[PDB]
Amino acid sequence: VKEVLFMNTGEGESSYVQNSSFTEKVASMAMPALENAVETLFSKDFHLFQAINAADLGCATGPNTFAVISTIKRMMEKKCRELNCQTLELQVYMNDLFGNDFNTLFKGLSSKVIEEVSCYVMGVPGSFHGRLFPRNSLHLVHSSYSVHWLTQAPKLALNKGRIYISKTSPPVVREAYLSQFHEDFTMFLNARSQEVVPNGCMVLILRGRQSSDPSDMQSCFIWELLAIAIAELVSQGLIDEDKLDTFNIPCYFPSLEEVKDIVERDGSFTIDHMEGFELDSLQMQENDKWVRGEKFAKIVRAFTEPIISNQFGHEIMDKLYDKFTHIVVSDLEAKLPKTTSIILVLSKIV
Amino acid sequence: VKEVLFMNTGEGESSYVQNSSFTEKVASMAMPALENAVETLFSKDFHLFQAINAADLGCATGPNTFAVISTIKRMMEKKCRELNTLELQVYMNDLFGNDFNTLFKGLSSCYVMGVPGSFHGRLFPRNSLHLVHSSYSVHWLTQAPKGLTSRELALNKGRIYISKTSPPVVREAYLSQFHEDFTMFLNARSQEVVPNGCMVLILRGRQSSDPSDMQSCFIWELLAIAIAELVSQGLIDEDKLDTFNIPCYFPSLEEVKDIVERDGSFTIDHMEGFELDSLQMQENDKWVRGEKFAKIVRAFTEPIISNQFGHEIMDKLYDKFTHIVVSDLEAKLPKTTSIILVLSKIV
Numbered sequence: 001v002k003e004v005l006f007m008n009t010g011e012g013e014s015s016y017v018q019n020s021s022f023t024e025k026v027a028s029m030a031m032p033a034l035e036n037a038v039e040t041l042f043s044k045d046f047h048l049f050q051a052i053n054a055a056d057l058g059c060a061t062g063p064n065t066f067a068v069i070s071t072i073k074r075m076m077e078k079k080c081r082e083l084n085c086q087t088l089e090l091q092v093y094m095n096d097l098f099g100n101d102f103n104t105l106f107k108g109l110s111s112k113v114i115e116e117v118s119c120y121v122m123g124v125p126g127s128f129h130g131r132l133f134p135r136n137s138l139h140l141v142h143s144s145y146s147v148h149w150l151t152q153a154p155k156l157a158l159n160k161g162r163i164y165i166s167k168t169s170p171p172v173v174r175e176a177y178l179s180q181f182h183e184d185f186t187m188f189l190n191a192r193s194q195e196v197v198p199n200g201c202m203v204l205i206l207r208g209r210q211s212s213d214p215s216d217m218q219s220c221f222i223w224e225l226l227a228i229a230i231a232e233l234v235s236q237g238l239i240d241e242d243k244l245d246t247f248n249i250p251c252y253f254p255s256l257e258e259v260k261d262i263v264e265r266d267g268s269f270t271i272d273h274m275e276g277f278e279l280d281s282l283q284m285q286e287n288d289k290w291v292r293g294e295k296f297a298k299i300v301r302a303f304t305e306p307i308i309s310n311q312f313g314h315e316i317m318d319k320l321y322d323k324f325t326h327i328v329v330s331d332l333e334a335k336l337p338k339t340t341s342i343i344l345v346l347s348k349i350v
Numbered sequence: 351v352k353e354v355l356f357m358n359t360g361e362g363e364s365s366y367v368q369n370s371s372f373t374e375k376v377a378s379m380a381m382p383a384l385e386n387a388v389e390t391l392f393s394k395d396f397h398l399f400q401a402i403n404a405a406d407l408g409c410a411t412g413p414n415t416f417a418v419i420s421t422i423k424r425m426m427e428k429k430c431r432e433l434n435t436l437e438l439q440v441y442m443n444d445l446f447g448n449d450f451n452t453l454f455k456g457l458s459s460c461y462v463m464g465v466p467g468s469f470h471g472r473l474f475p476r477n478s479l480h481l482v483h484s485s486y487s488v489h490w491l492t493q494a495p496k497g498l499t500s501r502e503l504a505l506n507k508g509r510i511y512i513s514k515t516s517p518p519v520v521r522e523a524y525l526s527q528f529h530e531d532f533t534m535f536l537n538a539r540s541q542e543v544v545p546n547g548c549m550v551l552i553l554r555g556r557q558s559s560d561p562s563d564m565q566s567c568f569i570w571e572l573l574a575i576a577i578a579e580l581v582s583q584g585l586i587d588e589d590k591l592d593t594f595n596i597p598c599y600f601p602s603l604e605e606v607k608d609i610v611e612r613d614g615s616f617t618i619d620h621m622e623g624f625e626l627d628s629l630q631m632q633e634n635d636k637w638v639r640g641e642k643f644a645k646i647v648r649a650f651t652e653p654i655i656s657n658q659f660g661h662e663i664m665d666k667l668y669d670k671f672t673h674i675v676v677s678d679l680e681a682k683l684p685k686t687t688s689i690i691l692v693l694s695k696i697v
């Protein structure tokens with residue numbers, strides 16, 4: 001399951017790295033959260049000797065992951081100047097599933113090194129649902145749009161005819177995802193529990209929703225639209241529907257209260273600061289519906305192609321996303337509901 | 351060179367991972383050297399608490415780097431029980447362009463991480479390493495040795511390494527460079543290894559103490575002729591074979607010592623040499639056993655050579671290589687001398 005989850009490898013031509021415009025803005029909207037978090041590590045005083053270990057979980061191949069490395073070093077070098085002490089060292093651990101194209105990210109990481117603080121970038125392949133780093137190895141943890149991806153799909157059963165929680169899917173389809181996120185998030189939080197230094201800090205950003213029920217269009221339109229495009233191909237006979245009935249995507253966008261309660265029960269890290277914000281799903285600067293759709297199709301296909309192609313096949317991929325782009329521009333007039341995101345800042349209690 | 355050096359990236363059939371034939375034997379001989387060093391770290395006692403950091407500097411995409419990790423972890427498993435809750439952190443280090451995807455594809459308490467970059471510079475935080483390993487990686491320079499230019503034409507015309515048909519300065523030139531680059535490796539590593547930490551490094555060198563001995567440099571010699579013959583055919587430019595010199599050096603046992611002596615940070619617990627057959631030689635067909643030697647040569651020299659002559663004429667080059675090895679020498683070459691060197695931070 002984690003053996004086939006990742007984003008478009010390479011390159012970048014219509015891959016993940018080229019189509020990372022939206023997610024870069026989420027980091028931009030949550031950059032101060034990191035900046036404050038770095039300052040707290042300096043207020044801790046204990047982390048000033050001798051080296052500070054930070055890590056980004058779920059870095060893909062895209063240009064977003066060294067954005068935060070830049071802010072961490074910049075902020076660190078700034079407070080390094082106030083302390084008037086050139087001893088600060090920084091080791092950064094970039095984490096993603098094995099299937100990820102590290103060479104593309106490495107080639108990207110190769111350019112930005114090459115200065116008060118030295119920076120050491122290491123790559124850590126593997127799932128973050130288990131333990132990745134030795135005990136008390138991390139002062140700071142950062143994660144953007146990677147937490148919501150589940151360990152496994154929630155569990156002749158059926159979620160007809162969708163790949164996700166919808167208005168057309170009652171009722172354990174909503175409940176399973178809820179308990180499943182609790183299942184996966186707990187592993188994550190608990191695996192971190194032994195990984196982060198006491199009084200450490202944590203900054204998590206994931207895609208969620210403000211609605212009480214996730215079947216609302218704003219919450220689940222990506223999967224609802226994907227579910228339509230695959231279903232229409234079944235009408236054409238290109239794909240068998242019983243595969244669509246069976247396939248549901250291992251991912252989940254939760255509400256803030258659900259997310260809080262998830263962190264509360266496991267009293268490892270107290271919630272320093274939580275917040276929910278909605279960005280315009282796509283820009284929206286183009287008056288051409290095809291332009292808005294294509295830019296949004298290529299970015300949606302970018303982070304969904306490998307996980308979907310596993311179930312439906314490499315070959316038919318091109319036709320599905322073309323049908324998906326079409327119903328966005330023509331059927332939906334290049335207009336989509338807002339996209340909620342959740343800034344989640346924690347600090348280990350032990 | 352740091353940008354354009356990597357082993358053959360991929361997974362078959364010319365990839366270095368499929369061509370680990372020779373190196374897996376060297377790792378076997380240095381396994382006891384590795385076995386002991388891992389145990390001396392336990393003798394250092396302080397390393398019991400709390401987690402031990404190991405680093406392989408030069409792991410390619412081949413499976414040989416897992417061979418080193420497996421024994422660190424397995425040896426520790428026995429040491430902990432007698433001592434009665436441990437953790438190991440292994441860093442895989444290599445240049446960029448290294449098929450870490452292939453590396454990590456072959457990959458899948460012990461937590462391993464990938465560290466891209468040269469070991470001629472800083473790679474790890476200060477006082478963070480207890481044990482460091484590097485097999486057949488250190489003898490690569492960061493550049494063609496200085497002093498092969500210009501004077502103002504020149505100089506190793508027409509070969510790619512130290513040979514008989516060459517001015518006396520090339521022996522000094524290659525020894526000059528290696529000294530400089532190795533110091534930086536020792537200099538950089540001097541500030542990462544914990545005090546009384548351990549460092550086990552493996553490279554190949556000469557036993558003849560003369561750089562131009564056929565035994566010591568047959569690989570580059572057999573290549574140099576292989577390139578040269580294809581030059582006569584007009585297939586490859588002539589000036590290129592002359593100007594280009596390979597960024598690698600095979601030091602003597604005594605020459606290694608000085609380098610380590612000059613830089614007082616590391617002391618020598620042990621240092622030895624062992625010569626292995628360049629090929630087996632357990633096979634009867636020369637034309638079908640020299641190819642395996644030809645394949646593994648192509649596994650680590652294709653990218654560094656394709657860079658200067660283009661990948662366009664590569665296939666014909668190693669075709670002559672195999673021909674030279676299997677016809678001229680009748681599939682018989684001098685043994686490859688390998689060097690085990692065990693060090694400790696003098697702090």
Ligand SMILES: Nc1ncnc2c1ncn2[C@@H]1O[C@H](CSCC[C@H](N)C(=O)O)[C@@H](O)[C@H]1O
Nearest residue numbers: 006058059060064065096097127128146149
């Ligand atoms: N269980 C898991 N363990 C480790 N990484 C995971 C994971 N589930 C999803 N991911 C990774 O999380 C990534 C989200 S895309 C990365 C988001 C952001 N643009 C950035 O560059 O940081 C994907 O590459 C995916 O491989």
Ligand SMILES: Cn1c(=O)c2c([nH]c(=O)n2C)n(C)c1=O
Nearest residue numbers: 020022023145146207222299303
């Ligand atoms: C659910 N979700 C998105 O919606 C999204 C992602 N990156 C984008 O740019 N978008 C829009 N990823 C990574 C994802 O997980």
Ligand SMILES: Cn1c(=O)c2c([nH]c(=O)n2C)n(C)c1=O
Nearest residue numbers: 370372373486487569598646650
């Ligand atoms: C110079 N040189 C070799 O000659 C060699 C290597 N691997 C082997 O199997 N051989 C023989 N490597 C890694 C190397 O750099």
